[PDB]
Amino acid sequence: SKVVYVSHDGTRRELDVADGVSLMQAAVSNGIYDIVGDCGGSASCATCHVYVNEAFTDKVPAANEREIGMLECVTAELKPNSRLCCQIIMTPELDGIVVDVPDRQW
């Protein structure tokens, strides 16, 4: 699947995350999450704070309270589709996901 994380000013990245990969995985593979915010899928960090375009949040796995927690933890432009790529799985239908990165990615 196609993946394009955006920045706060709009600058984005572009991976190729397939069905089963989390944009966080691929992103941390193309050098997207160059930072050190990995909770081993344990949902205990806040550096993976991001925003998946509304066309890939309800298409990809719309995680529950867990993702709404660490996400609710970030201190940036939270959204209805706010997300921490750690669980946004890229599928073959969501080929072309647009992710949004905030300026407050604590």
Q: Which residues are annotated as a binding site?
A: 39, 45, 48, 86
Does 86 contact ligand FES by CB under 6 A?
Answer: yes
Does 28 contact ligand FES by CB under 6 A?
Answer: no
User: What is the total count of residues that contact ligand FES (CB under 6 A)?
Assistant: 10
User: Binding site for [2Fe-2S] cluster: which residues?
Assistant: 39, 45, 48, 86
Sheet holding 3-6: strands in order across?
3-6, 97-100, 50-52, 82-83
Other CB atoms within 10 A of residue 86 CB: 27
> Distance between CA atoms of 92 and 48, rounded to whole angstroms?
23
Does 61 contact ligand FES by CB under 6 A?
Answer: no
Does 88 contact ligand FES by CB under 6 A?
Answer: no
> Distance between CA atoms of 45 and 12, rounded to whole angstroms?
22
Residues that bind ligand FES (CB under 6 A): 24, 37-39, 43, 45, 48, 70, 84, 86
